[PDB]
Design an enzyme around this catalytic site. Structure first.
Site, short mmCIF file in Angstrom:
data_model
loop_
_atom_site.label_atom_id
_atom_site.label_comp_id
_atom_site.label_asym_id
_atom_site.label_seq_id
_atom_site.Cartn_x
_atom_site.Cartn_y
_atom_site.Cartn_z
N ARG A 1 -0.03 4.69 3.23
CA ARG A 1 0.28 4.31 4.45
C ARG A 1 0.73 5.35 5.40
O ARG A 1 0.67 5.26 6.65
CB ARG A 1 0.92 3.11 4.69
CG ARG A 1 0.42 1.85 4.30
CD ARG A 1 1.38 0.62 4.66
NE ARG A 1 2.48 0.40 3.51
CZ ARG A 1 3.59 0.11 3.81
NH1 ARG A 1 4.11 -0.51 4.94
NH2 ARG A 1 4.32 -0.01 2.52
N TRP B 1 -9.10 6.67 -0.76
CA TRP B 1 -9.25 7.33 -1.87
C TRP B 1 -8.06 7.07 -3.01
O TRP B 1 -7.17 6.54 -2.84
CB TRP B 1 -9.19 8.97 -1.58
CG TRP B 1 -7.89 9.40 -0.82
CD1 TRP B 1 -6.79 9.29 -1.47
CD2 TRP B 1 -7.57 9.66 0.33
NE1 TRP B 1 -5.88 9.77 -0.83
CE2 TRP B 1 -6.42 10.12 0.61
CE3 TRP B 1 -8.62 9.66 1.50
CZ2 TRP B 1 -5.88 10.37 1.73
CZ3 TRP B 1 -8.08 9.86 2.81
CH2 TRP B 1 -6.73 10.48 2.87
N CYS C 1 0.92 -1.16 0.02
CA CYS C 1 -0.31 0.03 0.05
C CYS C 1 0.80 1.20 0.12
O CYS C 1 1.47 1.44 1.00
CB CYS C 1 -0.96 0.00 1.32
SG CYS C 1 -2.10 1.55 1.20
N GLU D 1 -4.55 4.20 -10.96
CA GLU D 1 -5.33 2.87 -10.89
C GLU D 1 -6.59 2.95 -11.70
O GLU D 1 -6.78 1.89 -12.34
CB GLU D 1 -6.09 2.82 -9.19
CG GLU D 1 -5.12 2.60 -8.23
CD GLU D 1 -5.68 2.81 -6.72
OE1 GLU D 1 -6.03 1.75 -6.27
OE2 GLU D 1 -5.86 3.88 -6.16
C1 HEM Z 1 -5.98 6.63 2.02
C2 HEM Z 1 -5.74 6.62 0.81
C3 HEM Z 1 -5.21 5.38 0.11
C4 HEM Z 1 -4.46 5.38 -1.10
C5 HEM Z 1 -4.06 6.64 -1.84
C6 HEM Z 1 -4.09 3.98 -1.18
C7 HEM Z 1 -3.36 3.35 -2.10
C8 HEM Z 1 -3.07 2.29 -2.68
C9 HEM Z 1 -2.91 1.66 -4.00
C10 HEM Z 1 -2.65 2.44 -5.12
C11 HEM Z 1 -2.73 0.25 -3.80
C12 HEM Z 1 -2.64 -0.60 -5.22
C13 HEM Z 1 -3.96 -1.00 -5.59
C14 HEM Z 1 -3.95 -2.02 -6.73
O1 HEM Z 1 -3.02 -2.15 -7.68
O2 HEM Z 1 -4.87 -2.82 -6.72
C15 HEM Z 1 -3.20 -0.17 -2.43
C16 HEM Z 1 -3.25 -1.56 -2.23
C17 HEM Z 1 -3.84 -1.77 -0.59
N1 HEM Z 1 -4.06 -0.98 0.15
FE1 HEM Z 1 -4.01 1.17 0.26
N2 HEM Z 1 -4.58 3.18 -0.26
C18 HEM Z 1 -5.16 3.84 0.80
C19 HEM Z 1 -5.76 3.54 1.90
C20 HEM Z 1 -5.96 2.22 2.14
C21 HEM Z 1 -6.68 1.68 3.55
C22 HEM Z 1 -7.58 2.68 4.27
C23 HEM Z 1 -6.20 0.40 3.64
C24 HEM Z 1 -6.88 -0.39 4.67
C25 HEM Z 1 -7.45 -0.03 6.06
C26 HEM Z 1 -5.44 0.02 2.81
C27 HEM Z 1 -5.15 -1.21 2.51
C28 HEM Z 1 -4.27 -1.64 1.33
C29 HEM Z 1 -4.08 -2.94 1.09
C30 HEM Z 1 -4.20 -4.25 1.92
C31 HEM Z 1 -3.54 -3.08 -0.22
C32 HEM Z 1 -3.09 -4.50 -0.78
C33 HEM Z 1 -4.30 -4.84 -1.64
C34 HEM Z 1 -4.04 -6.28 -2.54
O3 HEM Z 1 -2.83 -6.85 -1.96
O4 HEM Z 1 -4.75 -6.51 -3.41
N3 HEM Z 1 -5.38 1.10 1.96
N4 HEM Z 1 -3.28 0.83 -1.80
C1 LIG Z 2 -6.87 -6.49 -5.50
N1 LIG Z 2 -6.70 -5.00 -5.72
C2 LIG Z 2 -6.93 -4.32 -4.49
C3 LIG Z 2 -7.48 -2.97 -4.58
C4 LIG Z 2 -8.20 -2.90 -5.92
C5 LIG Z 2 -8.87 -1.70 -6.19
C6 LIG Z 2 -8.60 -0.70 -5.41
C7 LIG Z 2 -7.52 -0.69 -4.44
C8 LIG Z 2 -7.68 0.50 -3.40
C9 LIG Z 2 -8.10 0.33 -2.05
C10 LIG Z 2 -7.61 1.48 -1.31
C11 LIG Z 2 -8.30 1.26 0.42
C12 LIG Z 2 -7.45 2.61 -1.68
C13 LIG Z 2 -6.73 2.84 -3.20
N2 LIG Z 2 -6.51 4.03 -3.43
N3 LIG Z 2 -6.96 1.60 -3.93
C14 LIG Z 2 -7.16 -2.03 -4.15
#
Ligand code: HEM
Ligand SMILES: CNCc1cccc(-c2cc(C)cc(N)n2)c1
Ligand code: HEM
Ligand SMILES: CNCc1cccc(-c2cc(C)cc(N)n2)c1
Ligand SMILES: C[C@H](O)[C@H](O)[C@H]1CNc2nc(N)[nH]c(=O)c2N1
Ligand SMILES: C[C@H](O)[C@H](O)[C@H]1CNc2nc(N)[nH]c(=O)c2N1
Ligand SMILES: [Zn+2]
Lengths: 418, 414
Positions: free
Chosen positions: A119, A288, A116, A293
């Site tokens: 974070r 957000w 992520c 993405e």
């Molecule tokens: C607040 C703004 C946030 C932004 C800008 C952000 C950004 C991202 C992005 C760009 C990805 C890659 C997504 C993909 O390629 O599918 C990601 C993955 C992830 N995010 Fe964040 N995120 C945010 C918030 C959060 C929150 C609130 C959580 C959990 C409480 C979280 C947990 C995760 C996890 C676990 C992944 C890995 C997903 C996977 O393995 O499929 N994120 N995030």
């Molecule tokens: C299996 N792909 C995971 C996945 C797929 C699509 C979007 C996200 C995502 C989630 C959060 C919390 C923030 C963000 N900006 N994007 C993650």
């Protein structure tokens, strides 16, 4: 001690946090699995209801960590908590988290999410306790409230809603959707696909459950909600809760005529949240978007909406050969339009330049206070313009800390219908 | 045991058995992945050398369908005799060619390996002086450049003996541009080469002090002090960079050289170490247009290009950097193609690498690949390699990093 270097700035950070890692990465001394999507099946407790000698050690480790975090350890409340968790497992084969432990656990699972880039925000997470839920109708109510709170008229707020933990594995709560809000996909009679090709199978399940599809390119899917192991149930999210953004371009007036849109709220709903040996199989979380993405992956992956050819035509580019870079050129314009549109409508969004810069600062913060930051370079580097962002040049160490978010099987592969 | 890799765009699944043949460390452990570490971190004894030599000779004779043959058993015996009496051994010419080609085949960070079996190997193991090395390198450049129809080649200098008599090319590539730090803190030319330019000037090089001065060769034979040589300018093919739509682009005064020729790596074949082994191929466009031209610590031209493009540079979310990066890379490809100098764009190259990877799994049982290096530095996910799972492991023969020679050389003059 393990060092990581930034090859742009020559900053070196020293990692000791990795000494607390629990699960296997998949790699060995002889093979690196860093680009495998699911490299490891190493889990902390076996599949079904664990024995006492299996659950209690994991509970103790989490309670120890939580009480360490708040400048206690060994205090009166820590020892009583240990004893309470001991009796609970003895008499129910599980235990229940205190509200504070649940919030701590959810925030630290986010903090520990090596994939992520977002974070730096980890400690500002709104936690909705939904462990009193009993039916799919109640799950729908909790999800509607999450969506409305998180959307906040475009000023998006990070949130997680936590449904009852797994007990025996036959009474799971699941959200069958992969995200709370996604668009349907339809196999067309000729052979092509309408809408989102990634969701064709899920869309078919919904139609097979009685959903009446409008059969368009951007049909918001219903929720398919499973409570206490029962058959899942369909619910339509009220459209006034679903914030959408029409995509237009600040220079190309023809862009709006492509009829593109996306939704504002990215809300992952198919992951599992593991805290102290407890497994929360339904825990939708949202934040957000980073523009890439939508602009790079959702719109331009070959197996998704695949719009590059359409945009390039309108741009009058040379599409005879790859070396004109017509794909790269359309790709930039599309991502310009996505950002421009969200910003015009005052919907929270971050570009990949700002996001990656924030993450470098988050890394520095974490090495300074925590002694490390687990990070997956393959996921953190954006899918366009990689090396003109700072994370491309940043070495990262990847390791698995608990509490954590984990993948889980899709429920239609395991659910025995009734 | 078997390992599976999946492509998430095509859902093709491939089965790796070749990883069972590695026995060198990746740097990862079972609980930490170091897959984004650039360098995850003096002569072999007789006892160390025997099993390294045996393993290599065994794989050579297996590759040519003569494992167990009389020639195989006699070659093993002969190699053991040399190690026993001389503490080292000498490769046959056939083994050297085979070893050099397979070092390339095993280079997990190289996207161009579909070409691995077409490598022209120049045996330079009879060389004894820096003047000799200069002659061998001139011939390599001329052969490889081929008036713009580039051909892959490697030139292999004598192997390490005691570590006190190494052959080294001190340049990191055969052809690079000088860099000069100015009193006001600006840099003229390539900032990456400021230190090596200083060494050259100290050794007597008279620099022109321009933006694109081809550096001299600094060549070390037999552990002696290195010596300067000027590559004859008519052997250095260069391409002036223009753009097919922006007539102002040529006024930036940009140019690059056509021949990419790495000269600071070490080639290990059967325990023998070839510390001077310059090798050359042809460019993928993003190497020049993205990294050489737009890295902040390199020529760093994004600002000047975006200005001439009249882009809004006030906010990052206008993606002006991204827009100017694309145009620069268009210019690089258009320029090389117009001058009929071999070059490959990142789309064509990654597509060929997927085909090569699938072939290698079919006929060899795998293909070690470093996703962090194989995925190009722009437009990552619109290339097929982004969606391809890869396994990384170290097979020998191999190309290896080695210390820069100015950090270990002990000087002899005055
Ligand atoms: C607040 C703004 C946030 C932004 C800008 C952000 C950004 C991202 C992005 C760009 C990805 C890659 C997504 C993909 O390629 O599918 C990601 C993955 C992830 N995010 Fe964040 N995120 C945010 C918030 C959060 C929150 C609130 C959580 C959990 C409480 C979280 C947990 C995760 C996890 C676990 C992944 C890995 C997903 C996977 O393995 O499929 N994120 N995030
Ligand atoms: C299996 N792909 C995971 C996945 C797929 C699509 C979007 C996200 C995502 C989630 C959060 C919390 C923030 C963000 N900006 N994007 C993650
Ligand atoms: C024939 C056309 C070739 C193409 C298009 C090609 C392409 C590339 C590219 C783009 C890189 C990454 C460079 C960087 O980012 O620093 C690379 C790395 C590499 N190439 Fe190839 N290459 C070719 C030929 C060769 C040959 C002939 C050899 C050796 C005989 C070779 C061995 C290597 C090695 C060892 C690396 C890793 C270098 C390092 O770790 O710094 N390549 N190649
Ligand atoms: C430190 N990176 C090594 C490096 C730096 C510069 C260029 C290359 C290269 C080498 C070959 C044979 C072909 C190619 N297209 N590029 C490799
Ligand atoms: C094979 C490879 O691991 C896979 O395509 C990964 C690459 N990196 C990624 N990075 C992000 N953020 N999201 C992804 O879905 C992927 N996919
Ligand atoms: C820190 C990171 O490992 C480093 O910047 C890598 C990323 N991937 C790369 N990939 C290639 N082809 N060349 C490089 O120099 C790098 N640098
Ligand atoms: Zn690894």
């Amino acid at each position: 001690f393990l060092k990581v270097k930034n090859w742009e700035t020559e900053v070196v950070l020293t990692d000791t946090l990795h000494l607390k890692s629990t699960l296997e990465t998949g790699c060995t001394e002889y093979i690196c699995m860093g680009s495998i999507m699911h490299p490891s099946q190493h889990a902390r407790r076996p599949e079904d209801v664990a024995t006492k000698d299996q659950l209690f050690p994991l509970a103790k480790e989490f309670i120890d960590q939580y009480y360490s975090s708040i400048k206690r350890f060994g205090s009166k409340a820590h020892m009583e908590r240990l004893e309470e968790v001991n009796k609970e497992i003895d008499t129910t084969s599980t235990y229940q988290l205190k509200d504070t432990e649940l919030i701590y656990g959810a925030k630290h699972a986010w903090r520990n999410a090596s994939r992520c880039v977002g974070r730096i925000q980890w400690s500002k997470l709104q936690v909705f306790d939904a462990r009193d839920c009993t039916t799919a109708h109640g799950m729908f109510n909790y999800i509607c409230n999450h969506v409305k709170y998180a959307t906040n008229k475009g000023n998006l707020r990070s949130a997680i809603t936590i449904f009852p933990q797994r007990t025996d594995g036959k009474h799971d709560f699941r959200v069958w959707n992969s995200q709370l809000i996604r668009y349907a996909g339809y196999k067309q009679p000729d052979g092509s696909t309408l809408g989102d090709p990634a969701n064709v199978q899920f869309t078919e399940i919904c139609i097979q459950q009685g959903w009446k599809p409008p059969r368009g390119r951007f049909d918001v899917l219903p929720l398919l909600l499973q409570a206490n192991g029962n058959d899942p149930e369909l619910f339509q999210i009220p459209p006034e809760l679903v914030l959408e953004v029409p995509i237009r371009h600040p220079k190309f007036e023809w862009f709006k005529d492509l009829g593109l849109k996306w939704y504002g709220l990215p809300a992952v709903s198919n992951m599992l949240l593991e805290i102290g040996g407890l497994e929360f199989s339904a825990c939708p979380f949202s934040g957000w978007y980073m523009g890439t993405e939508i602009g790079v992956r959702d719109y331009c992956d070959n197996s998704r909406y695949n719009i590059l050819e359409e945009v390039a035509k309108k741009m009058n580019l040379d599409m005879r050969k790859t070396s004109s870079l017509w794909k790269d050129q359309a790709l930039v314009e599309i991502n310009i339009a996505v950002l421009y549109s969200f910003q015009s409508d005052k919907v929270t969004i971050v570009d990949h330049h700002s996001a990656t810069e924030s993450f470098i600062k988050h890394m520095e913060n974490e090495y300074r206070c925590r002694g490390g930051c687990p990070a997956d370079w393959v996921w953190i580097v954006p899918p366009m313009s990689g090396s003109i962002t700072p994370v491309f040049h940043q070495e990262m160490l990847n390791y698995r800390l608990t509490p954590s978010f984990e993948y889980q099987p899709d429920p239609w592969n395991t659910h025995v219908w009734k």
